Swiss-Prot record, chain A:
Changing residue 67 to H: In ESTRR; results in highly reduced activity. Residues 7-229 are annotated as: Transactivation AF-2. Composed of three domains: a modulating N-terminal domain, a DNA-binding domain and a C-terminal ligand-binding domain. The modulating domain, also known as A/B or AF-1 domain has a ligand-independent transactivation function. The C-terminus contains a ligand-dependent transactivation domain, also known as E/F or AF-2 domain which overlaps with the ligand binding domain. AF-1 and AF-2 activate transcription independently and synergistically and act in a promoter- and cell-specific manner. AF-1 seems to provide the major transactivation function in differentiated cells. Belongs to the nuclear hormone receptor family. NR3 subfamily. The lineage of its organism: Eukaryota, Metazoa, Chordata, Craniata, Vertebrata. This is Estrogen receptor. Disulfide bonds: none annotated. Residues 1-229 are annotated as: Self-association. The gene is ESR1. Changing residue 220 to A: Reduces PELP1-mediated activation of transcriptional activity.
Length: 229, 234
């Protein structure tokens, strides 16, 4: 596997090159709904996410089935971390798209507040683009790894592979911090601080999901089809 | 005092603060029904909660926070703490959850649901801990991280006080991180292995959050603010 042979700098480069573009809401600036705009935006982001996933080093070494399970578990967290990153330089506001910039007053409010808090945390920490892409990849690989239903040798090799790629991403994060001039202590601390926020993103994704089942999630089969294509 | 602790004193303080393992209500009618399974687990959890508050009060830095912030952290973290305790106890019992020494359940007895899905996840966490050879000293660090980290991002914070509280939480979390690293360095791990193992332990916390959320979601009808406040004051 090419992925396990990458240096820190090549891992960063691969992830930066794979980044999807920032998409616009289909809001017509000449025409005078919220869920409609977000749904349409998310549906377009999802197509890019599948193609971005395929470019995350190590991801395509997995079976199609395991690729889908990871996307199933991670998709909402990935959209959410994207949103939080885009919003970082806009305190008090969520930048769903350049033409859909919302404050607290608008759009559940609970989930909004949590997204804003994550954004403030990223700002306070001076989160860098290179760090962002590492975290986004970690979410993809980590979110679904503990819930693989299979007991075959293959499933064991797949889990092991995921853990090895996650270790590479960890090495990458540490290398970026050492290059930026952080001491060893600061490196371990900052890595912990970044990984701990992932647990908040899991939470937000779960609450988002919970607030939905008062009323569509991409199915296994839909995701499998999108991967195959 | 908490920010002046060395790695070794932090470990010591956490080890000394560990709550006892409780027993489930003696001699329930077996086999279990949904109602009585939930009855036994609820009673067990309610008793564990009192000990958890006493344990929390001894986590270095926790009692420096306002009562209000102490409660908010326990509110967000309590189920994750019970869950990580269960996973730790179950580590040396593959395929089984050790709710208590006298309540050791295998997957088959999860099917008393609406349960089995969350059981499977708990078992997977237990196997992950086993495979990684998770040590007691590491466990107590992780459990403290959950307490301090789970509720820290959802402080409705405008005041300088709220900012100093959050800063304090982050400084104590940094100390726990240093502590975990020190334990790993002492155990003989290289620098690379140290960073990797720390990452692997912290990433499991995200799965424990998930299990806590799903547990909550599968609840078809939580310790109140007032209960938690009262237990802290006492
Ligand atoms: C269905 O899944 C959820 C889960 C939670 C919520 N939410 C409202 C709550 F149900 F919770 F009340 S939410 O958590 O607040 C969610 C976070 C943020 O706001 C919502 C939203 C958001 C809306 C709608 C959507 O549908 C797209 C999926 C529909 N498609 C998938 C497969 C093809 C056909 C159907 C996804 C995402 C956001 C978003 C958007 C973009 C972004 O780049 C970043 C963030 C809403 C929907
Ligand atoms: C039988 O039907 C199900 C259905 C699902 C599950 N669950 C999945 C499974 F665990 F079986 F795999 S579970 O819902 O996720 C939940 C996790 C675990 O089992 C339940 C339970 C649990 C019960 C109750 C409770 O407090 C109840 C209320 C507490 N008090 C608050 C204020 C005063 C009044 C009440 C907390 C916790 C557990 C526990 C318990 C202790 C522990 O040390 C570790 C774990 C289990 C059985």
């Amino acid at each position: 596997s090419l992925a396990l042979s990458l240096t820190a700098d090549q891992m960063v480069s691969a992830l930066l090159d794979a980044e999807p573009p920032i998409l616009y809401s289909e809001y017509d600036p000449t025409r005078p709904s919220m869920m409609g705009l977000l749904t349409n935006l998310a549906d377009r982001e999802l197509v890019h996410m599948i193609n971005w996933a395929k470019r995350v080093p190590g991801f395509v070494d997995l079976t199609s089935h395991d690729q889908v399970h990871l996307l199933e578990c991670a998709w909402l967290e990935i959209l959410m971390i994207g949103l939080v990153w885009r919003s970082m330089e806009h305190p008090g506001k969520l930048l769903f798209a350049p033409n859909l910039l919302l404050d607290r007053n608008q759009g559940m409010v609970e989930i909004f507040d949590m997204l804003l808090a994550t954004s403030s945390r990223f700002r306070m920490m001076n989160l860098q683009g290179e760090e962002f892409v590492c975290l986004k990849s970690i979410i993809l690989l980590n979110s679904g790894v503990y819930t693989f239903l299979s007991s075959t040798l293959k499933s064991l090799e797949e889990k092991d592979h995921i853990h090895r790629v996650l270790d590479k991403i960890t090495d990458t994060l540490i290398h970026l911090m050492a290059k930026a001039g952080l001491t060893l202590q600061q490196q371990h601390q900052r890595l912990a601080q970044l990984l701990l926020i992932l647990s908040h993103i899991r939470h937000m994704s779960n609450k988002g999901m919970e607030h939905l089942y008062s009323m569509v999630v991409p199915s296994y089969d839909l995701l499998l089809e999108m991967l195959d294509a």
